């Protein structure tokens, strides 16, 4: 709240007022900056004394290089810095298509971020929460942004010289709009999620969504085509017979490029179709490569030596290529940075080996979209240190100055899933959720639980998280929410185990304290999780599909009752045996079995509730 | 009772003693006898009487008419003739409700009382198969022991038994585990993977476990799945043709039920190249073809399809449907409709075998009992082509009138509907529905379908006090009713409030109606989780419990967003500022706003919620 007396020259209006909006989140010293554009490096400062000379190359860089000029000059008088940013381009992607649709404020604080960062470019991954004029079933109840909300968030980042890409889907992966059951829906469909290849109301849909997106400034959209093993297999299959597939692809990704072509896109996708690379398809394929930048997404590997592998097959066939990485927040309520350091540590020494040129990095919200929106900030710094400089030495400063936490402080978020016998290199290992979902009388995850060192870890952690709350200013909703989630899992993750022990053993007292204590006050600690949950989501999305939680919430808090009933009327003698404690746990799945941790992956919160059917018909 | 039989069995002795719980005979004396002459004879006057049947079950039937006939009689003069060699009942086991077996006794005795020869359950992956550990794990899956005696309290009354089970798809909820020895099964969505051993030793399995068993008699499955060869089968074998695919597993599974001595049934839908047609013939002539029907309000319309199926062979049955597949309420009244006109089809082509199917889809919601009312009928269309008998049996066999006792269906019969469409249900999406998000609301005509509810509820009350056994039905549609009379416009009604700001009107549904609500929701699930944990075992109600406690949640975050901008904490709902589509255009050019909506999990979100 002391006015900075930071002094610059060199500035237009628009960096000046920017620069204003940043004040915001860092604390410039009563220095003199004199700014210039410089194609010498993408940032440079040098000076001492309080007066400072700062070049970029690109606009939006001066962002990243006031950030770097607060944090050095609390070390150091004397400033010596030049970076070479590895990327031309370097993008963050937020999922607005599984039931968290960012909100119109919170963009504008992730563009904010992004720019401080060293961001060049946001992106919203939309497969239906866009807005098409005559397709009023495409968004709806979804919270689909309207032409206008997509105008405000471009223009808002173009306040910081950052660059607005929509990421799209024109053939698959649009289940939520083609459930509705109108004839102007159905008629589009091929089967699944897949539109219909040939069908001339799908192109109509299609130039419909490049409509939408003409009203924006940006010219380059992500169209998607990621894999879909169905195409063509439908109602295709019914209505045409059997077609070479890679063919049919072609000639739908050229109907689609040819819409692009109207409306003026440059097009990027997913690389998948293009893997391939009969003769005359070959050629077809070969002939579209030449008309899309292609992305090679992965988020998974361990070794540079893995990325560098496919890098070299993709530059056999295309050198218009880009590489989509991985901010881990789609396994549940909690994100995994410390797995997406790890990769991408390994990642960006393939892409700058390959001279890569653009990396997008994804932030996926598979099933529900549990995961906060800001809880990947870690991530986002982890790739930008290693774009504008190739290490990791300043980014524990460099987030602090960002954010108002040490990165290990922020990193701390992970921790349900961090359990201790986990090696740090295995993906998707998620017991933050799949405790949290387990029924209590049918506890079909049981065997992956071990109690012995889980409940202190949970129970730790929430004191850990409690903790960081206390410092993390705006940011300490995300550790709120995570402290009470790890407080319930501490007790959680073996309470079935326990009723079952309980029971085998007649210990009905036992029985009792669970019934009549232990599993009403997990209720209400779910309960005060709810809220917690509720006021982040509302905080960071719009309303929409904050339902579906209140849905799977709603039904866990009337199983725990459930457990209560039943024990209840056990105890009472009105049963002779409980009939789901005389069933015994299986595994629920091998997926990890060959390991010696006993935590695995289960990412579907249907088949972690129950066992029973519940969208089948 | 103190009636006196000669010529009796102590088989037939036993059973008459375990069916006077359900029927009261009088004091009257009954020869009986065997005899080719008819189905069912009886004969005589004052006190004394003659009874005749044909084949050993039909004892049961003739008893309860002869119960029926003294209550307004000295003199009898009954002779039937039935025209199905087998009517059968097939109960759905596999979509959450595993009925009991306490239940499939009661549902047994009273089969053997309408005349019904057959009783089958409907198991996809609800029995259970040595060396499959996740095939019906936590799904309540019968142990051989409750099969055999299941069987065997069926045979007291001589009763055959016939599984239904599935060989090739709809195992969805055996597919799903993500483990080697299971995942190796399958080609794709519910289907598993023709040519590979490792599915033939389950298939193997499958008929271990049903040669336990006395019966000799299976329907195997096999119908319509979409995408056969189109998953792991088309990664692994590339293009095949699809229909000799299904021929060469189909070989496969009846040269496996030979080894075990089964005779197969099966739905027909594969029968609908010239080395195709050659193995189809082969295969068609080792098999009985269902020909499955629940829909036709003619005649007519039923035929057509006979004649296509007598074209490709004549071991042809019918499968008909009481309906208890849409939601909590079931549909007597459709079930009734069609089941005329379908009896007039089955015996205008000479169909010797019928099997009156009830499903269970998307959850098993509906009572097991409440269908009683179409089993009683097609008892009577088969025994006497007729229904003049009909209430009146039924009351004997039940202690309701069967107009009573169809007053279970009201949830579903708003007023303006035609009779003969099917799947219009009210009684579940109603339910289900959001409210703040109610995306079924222009389906809703609340001047019409109020008081149709709020009456529905004070019919059923009454009729719950008369009902004895069967009273547990009723007082859980009674409840049902009750709480739909007044949520069929809860969500129009918060919209017009808001679009009005009238505050007060949504301080009360926020305050006092919305908790109302809560409340007798939660007592309908008290009731359903009693009729549930009655008829059925215990596992698969958990689904439900998941379903209302998510409902009830949302019913909160109504209250709670109301709340907050009572409070000036929000300048606009957004939930309120979408406007209501049409949920489904199946049923638009229509004259009544009813629809079909069954699946819960798009009644009650726009959201995602199973996808990734
Ligand atoms: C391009 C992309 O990432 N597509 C999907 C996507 N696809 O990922 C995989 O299919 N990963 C994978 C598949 C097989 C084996 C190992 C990893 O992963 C994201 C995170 O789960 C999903 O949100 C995206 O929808
Ligand atoms: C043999 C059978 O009845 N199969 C399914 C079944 N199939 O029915 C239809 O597919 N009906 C239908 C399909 C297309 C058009 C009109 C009716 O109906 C039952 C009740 O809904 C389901 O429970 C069964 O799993
Ligand atoms: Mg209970
Ligand atoms: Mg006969």
Same mark, same amino acid.
């Given at each position: 709240?002391?006015?900075?007396?930071?002094?610059?020259?060199?500035?237009?209006?628009?960096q000046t007022?920017?620069?204003?909006?940043?004040?915001?989140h860092?604390?410039?010293?009563?220095?003199?900056?004199?700014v210039?554009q410089?194609?010498?490096?993408?940032?440079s400062?040098?000076?001492?004394?309080?007066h400072?000379?700062?070049?970029?190359?690109?606009?939006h860089?001066?962002?990243?290089?006031?950030?770097?000029?607060?944090?050095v000059?609390?070390?150091?008088?004397?400033?010596?810095?030049?970076?070479?940013?590895?990327?031309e381009?370097?993008?963050?992607?937020?999922?607005?298509?599984?039931?968290?649709?960012?909100?119109?404020?919170?963009?504008?604080?992730?563009?904010?971020?992004?720019?401080?960062?060293?961001?060049?470019?946001?992106?919203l991954?939309?497969?239906?929460?866009?807005?098409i004029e005559?397709?009023?079933?495409?968004?709806?109840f979804?919270?689909?942004?309207s032409?206008?909300?997509?105008?405000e968030?471009?223009?808002?980042?173009?306040?910081?010289?950052?660059?607005?890409?929509?990421?799209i889907?024109?053939?698959?992966? +649009?289940?939520?709009? $083609?459930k509705?059951?109108?004839?102007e829906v !159905?008629? @589009?469909?091929? #089967?699944? =999620? %897949?539109?219909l290849?040939?069908?001339?109301?799908?192109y109509?849909?299609?130039?419909?969504?490049?409509?939408?997106?003409s009203?924006?400034?940006?010219?380059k959209?992500?169209?998607?085509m990621?894999?879909?093993?169905?195409?063509?297999?439908?109602?295709?299959?019914? +209505?045409?017979?059997? $077609?070479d597939?890679?063919?049919?692809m072609? !000639?739908? @990704?050229?109907? #689609?490029? =040819? %819409?692009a072509?109207?409306?003026?896109?440059?097009?990027?996708?997913?690389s998948?179709?293009?893997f391939?690379?009969?003769?005359?398809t070959?050629?077809?394929?070969d002939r579209?490569?030449?008309?899309?930048?292609?992305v090679?997404?992965?988020?998974?590997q361990?070794?540079?030596?893995k990325?560098?592998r496919?890098?070299?097959?993709?530059?056999?066939?295309?050198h218009?290529?880009?590489?989509?990485?991985?901010?881990?927040?789609?396994?549940?309520?909690?994100?995994?940075?410390?797995?997406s350091?790890?990769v991408?540590?390994?990642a960006?020494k393939?892409?700058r080996?390959?001279?890569?040129?653009?990396?997008?990095?994804?932030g996926?919200?598979?099933?529900?979209?549990?995961?906060?929106?800001?809880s990947?900030?870690?991530?986002?710094?982890?790739?930008?240190?290693?774009?504008?400089?190739?290490?990791?030495?300043?980014?524990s400063?460099?987030?602090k100055?960002?954010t108002?936490?040490?990165?290990?402080?922020f990193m701390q978020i992970?921790?349900?899933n961090?359990?201790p016998?986990?090696?740090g290199?295995?993906?998707?290992?998620?017991?933050?959720?799949y405790?949290?979902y387990?029924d209590?009388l049918?506890?079909?995850?049981?065997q992956?639980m071990?109690?012995?060192?889980?409940?202190?870890?949970?129970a730790?952690?929430?004191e850990?998280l409690?903790?960081?709350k206390?410092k993390?200013?705006?940011?300490?909703?995300?550790?709120?929410?995570q402290?009470?989630?790890?407080?319930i899992?501490?007790?959680?993750?073996?309470?079935?185990?326990?009723?079952?022990?309980?029971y085998?053993?007649?210990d009905?007292?036992?029985?009792?304290?669970?019934?009549?204590?232990?599993?009403?006050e997990?209720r209400?600690?779910?309960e005060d999780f709810?809220?917690?949950?509720?006021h982040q989501?509302?905080?960071?999305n719009?309303?929409?599909?904050?339902?579906?939680?209140d849905?799977?919430?709603?039904?866990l808090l009337?199983?725990?009752?459930?457990?209560?009933?039943?024990?209840?009327?056990?105890?009472?003698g009105?049963?002779?045996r409980?009939?789901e404690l005389?069933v015994?746990?299986?595994?629920?799945?091998?997926?990890?079995?060959?390991?010696?941790?006993?935590?695995?992956?289960?990412?579907?919160?249907?088949?972690?509730?129950?066992?029973?059917?519940?969208?089948?018909?």
């Open positions: 709240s002391m006015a900075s007396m930071v002094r610059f020259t060199g500035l237009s209006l628009k007022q920017a620069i204003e909006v940043l004040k915001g860092i604390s410039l010293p009563d220095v003199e900056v004199a210039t410089s194609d010498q490096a993408s940032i400062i040098e000076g001492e004394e309080g400072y000379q700062l070049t970029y190359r690109k606009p860089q001066l962002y990243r290089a006031l950030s770097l000029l607060v944090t000059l609390a070390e150091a008088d004397k400033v010596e810095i030049e970076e070479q940013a590895a990327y381009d370097l993008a963050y992607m937020v999922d607005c298509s599984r039931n968290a649709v960012l909100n119109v404020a919170s963009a504008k604080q992730m563009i904010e971020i992004l720019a401080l960062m060293g961001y060049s470019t946001f992106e991954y939309m497969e239906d929460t866009y807005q005559g397709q009023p079933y495409f968004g709806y979804r919270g689909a942004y032409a206008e909300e997509l105008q968030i471009e223009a808002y980042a173009q306040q910081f010289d950052v660059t607005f890409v929509p990421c889907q024109t053939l698959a992966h +649009l289940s939520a709009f $083609v509705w059951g109108v004839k !159905q008629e @589009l469909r091929d #089967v699944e =999620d %897949i539109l290849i040939g069908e001339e109301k799908v109509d849909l299609i130039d419909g969504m490049f409509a939408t997106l009203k924006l400034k940006t010219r959209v992500n169209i998607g990621d894999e879909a093993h169905l195409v063509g297999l439908g109602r295709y299959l019914i +209505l045409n017979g059997v $077609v597939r890679s063919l049919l072609c !000639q739908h @990704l050229e109907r #689609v490029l =040819d %819409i072509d109207k409306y003026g896109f440059h097009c990027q996708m997913w998948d179709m293009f391939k690379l009969p003769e005359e070959r050629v077809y394929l579209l490569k030449d008309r899309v930048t292609l090679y997404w992965d988020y998974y361990d070794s540079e030596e990325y560098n496919n890098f070299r097959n993709h530059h056999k066939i295309s218009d290529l880009a590489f989509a990485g991985g901010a881990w927040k789609w396994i549940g309520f909690t994100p995994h940075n410390h797995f350091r790890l991408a540590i390994e960006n393939a892409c080996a390959n001279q890569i040129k653009e990396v997008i990095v994804t996926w919200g598979d099933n529900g979209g549990e995961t906060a929106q800001f990947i900030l870690p991530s986002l710094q982890i790739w930008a240190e290693l774009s504008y400089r190739n290490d990791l030495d300043g980014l400063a460099h987030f100055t960002n108002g936490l040490t990165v290990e402080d992970d921790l349900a961090l359990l016998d986990l090696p290199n295995l993906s998707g290992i998620n017991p933050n959720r405790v949290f387990q209590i049918c506890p079909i995850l049981d992956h071990t109690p012995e060192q889980d409940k202190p870890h949970f730790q952690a929430a850990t409690a903790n960081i206390e993390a200013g705006n940011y300490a909703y995300l550790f709120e929410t402290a009470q989630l790890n407080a899992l501490s007790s959680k993750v073996d309470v079935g185990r326990r009723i079952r022990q309980a085998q053993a007649d009905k007292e036992s029985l009792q304290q669970i019934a009549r204590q232990e599993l009403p997990l209400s600690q779910i709810h809220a917690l949950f509720s989501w509302l905080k960071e719009k309303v929409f599909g904050l339902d579906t939680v849905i799977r919430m709603g039904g009337q199983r725990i009752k459930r457990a209560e009933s039943r024990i209840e009327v056990y105890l009472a009105q049963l002779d409980i009939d005389e015994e746990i299986l595994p629920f799945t091998d997926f990890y079995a060959d390991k010696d941790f006993a935590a695995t992956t289960a990412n579907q919160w249907h088949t972690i509730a129950t066992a029973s059917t519940i969208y089948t018909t």
